Amino acid sequence: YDRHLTIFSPDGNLYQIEYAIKAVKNTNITSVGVKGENCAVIISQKKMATQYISQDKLLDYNNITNIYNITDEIGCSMVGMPGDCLSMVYKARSEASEFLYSNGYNVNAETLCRNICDKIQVYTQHAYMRLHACSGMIIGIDENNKPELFKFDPSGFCAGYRACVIGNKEQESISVLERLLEKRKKKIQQETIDEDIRNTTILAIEALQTILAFDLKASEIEVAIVSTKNRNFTQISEKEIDNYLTYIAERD
């Protein structure tokens, strides 16, 4: 009986977690976030997760978002079963508020991600819960004005990347995001002062056009920079996203 989330398989694996991770990738929602100099950006495909419910028929797409904001400074982009994603945001929205209440200062973008993975693992070890099929990013700005970016999975794993993707294209997105982040590093201009608009946001956007080969209709993504001089995880209006979608004649 490998039905449990606890009983180790004879080879030692936990087959439930591997099943839980599979269910995340079944949603085929891509979410990419990259980190820059004093700026972090995040994108998601702004679509309803492919489920038993009928596909997009009569909804108002101005209310389907895979990105939330845990506090006024720490955003996130949960991806998974839509029921579990909302539970993760609310559990996150509590651990961040409890930390602020009991310590008098905002939680770091990484401690908040480390707390969840402690809550997440508790489900994994015990037998009478179910794995929250919800893996997502968490971004924010620490006390040193350095941008942060962490990823956590149905298994407790709070690695924390510098340019990460969650969804179902990790087979190739490991490489497309690998080489395309080197380009910004390779340029030795250093004249980019608070120039995140044309260096980080467009980098993540042109990173999405390559992971999935669509043309990115502006009503199919939302970006949320948390750069310094904002520090507030603002969501960028669609009037500005389509500006970067016109940046295909000279960028990529």
Place this chain on the structure above:
Amino acid sequence: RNLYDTDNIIYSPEGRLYQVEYASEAIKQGTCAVAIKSKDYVVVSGLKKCISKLSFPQEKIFKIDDYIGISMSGITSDAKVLTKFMQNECLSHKFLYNENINIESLVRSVADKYQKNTQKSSKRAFGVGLMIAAYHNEPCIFETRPNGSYFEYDALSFGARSHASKTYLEKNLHLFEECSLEELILHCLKALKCSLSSESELTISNTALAVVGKNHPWQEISSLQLEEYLSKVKM
């Protein structure tokens, strides 16, 4: 089938929950019992069960409050539990306040006591359905299935041979415009007679029957007084 049956949590691949559907045919094994709503009165009659030639007939009609009475059909003990709940509910309301418990808000309080026995895996859904016959401002008849559900009716029948008893009721529109309880009680008793199979025991002064109406608290029909009704039935 063989698998989606053991516990009361598993949903069968058709979305049908078996263990409450299996407990919803325990009422089908209970004796018939009919409730008829007049314009101003409610009449409930039920055929008691004589399990042996020596045994007294069991109880099919229970009183709850001054104007509220029920009638079980199913596992007797599971029915007894819900009586003590509603009795200890109307009494509480008659004590907490001085009003009489609102009949609809009493059914909900018992129509959702079934559910809390359905959600958990360590409890079984009650077997019994009920006919909550009561008069608060307008005569009313409610039924609560083993699955948490309730309805307001004009006539009923439970289980044993309720198919035939429904036929008499589903065709009769007399009941509303019919004053003269005497005529209504004959309307109700004949319906019960339809369920009672022939070549067998006939309706005698050992079948429970009670009324409740405008200035009529829920009251039995005494053996001496019910006897003359039985004569008017056979004709």
Place this chain on the structure above:
Amino acid sequence: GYDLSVSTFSPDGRLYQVEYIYKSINNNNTALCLECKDGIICCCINSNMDKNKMIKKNSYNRIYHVNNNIIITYSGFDGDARNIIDRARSEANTYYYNFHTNIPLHILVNRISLYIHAYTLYWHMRPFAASIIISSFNEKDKGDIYCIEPNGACYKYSGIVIGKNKEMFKTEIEKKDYKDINVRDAIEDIYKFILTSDDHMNKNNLQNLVNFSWICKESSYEFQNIHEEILTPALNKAVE
């Protein structure tokens, strides 16, 4: 083999015992709720109650409300739905004790969606088996209709049918821009559906089976069961 308990993921990842619920609510009495230029009109076609012929005239109602300005219908188990409403009223009362203001809609839905979802996480608890539609209208902001499925997944709509015949109703609601068609005359267009679009089980005798109420400018934007003297002129269904 993996579909016994709700707490075990299927090897494909498709968590069974939650999709089985979808089959159940897709085989119960349909419920409809769309937004008009003046307000939200709901609907509930209890098409499975036509055997009984003994129900009271208009007893069985699925258009529950809360705070007298939020409409909560459903389509599923009559018990599991009522449990949620009791929570929904309780969730709204707890808000009023603590904030002196009726709970705004777009967070009541969450605190229910969590409540629905939280039951799909245990060995023992049986997951809820009832979808929920939550709606309200404001004069400053036009109305909004939230649909909730088993296992959370609250979504915002502008018109939705849930129940047995939900599919081809949806193809027929979107024929007209009901966000401009007024609520007062939108009832007739709904009847032209139920009469034909249902499973032919509602013909000319439906004044009791279908029961709907709106929230519009006629009610000063408050939950108002529609008087029968509006329904009868709206039964100008003489077709063919």
Place this chain on the structure above:
Amino acid sequence: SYDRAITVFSPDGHLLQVEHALEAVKKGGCAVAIKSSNFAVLAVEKKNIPKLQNPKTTEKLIKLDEHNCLAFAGLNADARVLVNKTRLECQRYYLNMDEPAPVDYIAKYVAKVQQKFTHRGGVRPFGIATLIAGFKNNKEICIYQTEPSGIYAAWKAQAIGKNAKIVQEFLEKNYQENMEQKDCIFLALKAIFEVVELSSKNVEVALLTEKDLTFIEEQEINSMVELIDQERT
């Protein structure tokens, strides 16, 4: 498990997990009680590895109070836990009643707790069958057998343990009414190893009076053992 019914009804109607408990009793050591006018002798069976395993195991002949024997049979693992509840109960009664607990109150208690466990959830029934010898409120000796099913009954002479049927049928055919001090011991010793060999190391017999239960020493146990073989020859 924990808090769930583990002793449920078989299709034939019996309780399986008690039925197995009775089989655990048969895999024990025989115990015998004999009644008389006021004194009740008890003999039991001990198996010990020679030259090791010093005879301080004292499984049976558990003293309960000033005047209460107990010579159980079955799982010694479920013996101390059962006895230590009675020795405790013997005192909670004496504390709340200010008189020694009568034997008839004890046997009611021992059977109560034994049956309690076969009736709750997530608890294994005791695999121990006990017999209690003691005095009622009126000074009258009375042996009270018990079984893991929870039933009990007084006895003039009852034997339990491994092959109780064979020893019992011998004890029901040559039982007098008011025997002597020495006569009772001889019947218990003669009967106790009709299922075991004559070796005087296996049997240990103890005697109970109004005051201060006495343990019979090896001298007359061996001497009576010298008398049983010559009966057998």
Place this chain on the structure above:
Amino acid sequence: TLGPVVTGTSVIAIKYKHGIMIAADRKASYGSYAKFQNVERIFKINNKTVMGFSGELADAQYLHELLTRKNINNLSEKKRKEDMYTPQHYHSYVSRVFYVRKNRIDPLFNNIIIAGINSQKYDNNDDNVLLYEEYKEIHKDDLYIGFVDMHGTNFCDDYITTGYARYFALTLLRDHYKDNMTEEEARILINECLRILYFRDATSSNFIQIVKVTSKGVEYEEPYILP
């Protein structure tokens, strides 16, 4: 709940032919200092009832929340106009709240009055609680004027004045009140009571709020007594 600091003062609730006429001044005094002079002390807890108030203000706004949310609990489970909570129900419920606390020793110092029309003979089966012809005669037996002392003492009369009018306006009422008065007869009688209070009662002032619970609804107005 340890001691009263922001306290109201007397209210008067008589019943005249068209319905109740419950009046109260609009001052809350922080001891001997008229800290608040526009506070309202007569709340609507139903379309047919009001709820008077005296004693410390911190507990009306408590007891207001208890009723106002019990009212909506009713308003959600209402199918017919006869399912509403009669003013008798509240006054028998508020009595329980005060009594159950007297079992403990936190009484929530108050002299709550529950007043309203205890009948349903007049169609108001469409509750616009969030946002809102001739009067009908009322049999004077369908009007319930409750009262609850902070010890649980409860009863109903034709006219209940609490707080401090129980020594001043009660004497006027007990010998000048007749059944089935009229609109302007009640107001001038009350105005002859509060004018007595304003003169002799230190913790009371002008600027009266008068609430009438008639067959159509609950109506408000803010006179200003002329000595």
Place this chain on the structure above:
Amino acid sequence: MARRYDSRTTTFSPEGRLYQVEYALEAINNASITIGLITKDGVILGADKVFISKLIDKANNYEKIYKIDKHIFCGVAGLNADANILINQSRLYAQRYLYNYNEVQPVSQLVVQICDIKQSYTQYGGLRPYGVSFLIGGYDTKDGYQLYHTDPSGNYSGWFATAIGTNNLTASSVLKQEWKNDMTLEEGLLLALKTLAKSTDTEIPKSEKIELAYLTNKDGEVYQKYLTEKEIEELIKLYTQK
């Protein structure tokens, strides 16, 4: 509930034994061996160390002969993983008794108190029984030097010389022959040395696999253990005597 996945660890068997307890006896009969001797001067305890590699410390620590109090020490023979939980526990009982009655707990009142916790896990709770069974030795002003052998069920037993563990039949067999009733500490050690050797079918032990300790009350329960430097001296007398 998930009754399908349960194993009913606290239920009988068609014969009357308990499957989990009967299996635990198998588990404790595949571990190492542990020996106990009572002499006229003191109680001896020896056990063969389980060897994994030569990188263990093997100089100051050893997981076969623990300590419970100044006068009570026990030799584990079974799953060492859950033996500690009966060491951190049995140490408490010897300290609760001292805390309560203001005297050192007699051993026979400690064995019965540690078997009962070992035995409550086979009665209820639905948890596996403790796969550990271990000797206990002690001295008392009541009845002197004492030895006690417990089992995973809980049914303990007094003893004079016991050799639980793997190959216990042979070690009991050799002990059943050469154990004098009244004996001496120094000569006592060589008996435990020999039975350890023959149990592991080796003429002479490796002095890095065997561990010994003894109580030998000197009016203070002096209770010396051994280091491998001293155990070499013991093997010196092993060749000469055998």
Place this chain on the structure above:
Amino acid sequence: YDRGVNTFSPEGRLFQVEYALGAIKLGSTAVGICVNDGVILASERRISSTLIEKDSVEKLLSIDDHIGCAMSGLMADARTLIDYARVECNHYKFIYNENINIKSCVELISELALDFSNLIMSRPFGVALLIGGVDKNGPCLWYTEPSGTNTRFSAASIGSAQEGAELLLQENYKKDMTFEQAEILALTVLRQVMEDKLSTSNVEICAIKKSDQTFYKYNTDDISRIIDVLPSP
């Protein structure tokens, strides 16, 4: 083997209660007869051997001053009902001064015989009471089967041979019947379902006469008088 205690059959009945009905077909074949002069209960004793004291084994208990009772099935599992009733019965007599109605006394036993269902124990009982008392409304006689369906009988029998005993009662019993006839009607039934001897060492006649309204077992003289009627030897 596997299914829980709260599991409905595909027919409607629970498993456990319908399983327990096998158990109640085991013990003594007691017979109780209700007449307008107070009820009478009689039961059997097949004593195992001459050893058992025959005095600590009882088949007819006494729930209160005015209620008798009869056993069947798991006797050990029954005392936990009689003891429970004996507590609530006196608890009732304390709060309300009057004695208890049997219908109420039987009701509160049944509400515990099915407490295993959980709306604390975890399995159903295997007993079949035959309670009968003389409180008011004349004497009564009920029957609490494990499934909690208490039915007010007039003359019913419980035990292994109750099917043969309920036939003799179903024929000879008549409503108009005096107590002297009531006593002999029971014995005639027991004489036709037991072994050779209808002696004092075989039957347990107790009665609660409507005159005294107090429980009153029969000693060896009050029991030997009845057996002499003997319609057919």
Place this chain on the structure above:
Amino acid sequence: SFSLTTFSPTGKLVQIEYALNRVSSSSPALGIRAKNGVIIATEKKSPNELIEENSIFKIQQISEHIGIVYAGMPGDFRVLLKRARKEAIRYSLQYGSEILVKELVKIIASIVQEFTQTGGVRPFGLSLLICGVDVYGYHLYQIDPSGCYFNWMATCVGKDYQNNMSFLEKRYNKDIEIEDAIHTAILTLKESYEGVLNEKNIEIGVAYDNKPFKILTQNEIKDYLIE
């Protein structure tokens, strides 16, 4: 709540056996003690450079002089590390002196052992190495998932650990310098590793002869790569 860890008929806890086969297939950790300190090292297979390596390091600090390293499930390590610190803090509250290793391990061992037995929970899928300096000397302990613990001169726990033992058995002497200890630890990780790029993919934590347990940073590892 029932035990998922059950004795197999042969006496083997089949659940623990399954956990070990997960330990014996993870990134190999390693620890060696010397005369003047103890070294613990682990290999972290260099992943795609998207990940910031310096935020997933496996060697973690327990207290001033005690460090840790694991080989197995990362998830069950963070929970065990966090609950290891609190027990270390708790000892420091009662006793001024910083906790000593030999009983810090007994605390953890009795914690890992619980999940081996208490119901509804699987055993931890990792093996820990707790190294530290104490007044009784240096220490290096290993904790199996079963809860059984050992004291080590040096050991390897991850995959390929059977030959890495034989590698260390022949290149270790009781009198060994701390700097020498590294070059007998880098090589044994270097020889075991495939695709040897032993830079930015290796973690080292040192005791330093009664100095605070410090993790050698990226500067201090290349200069130790002379061989």
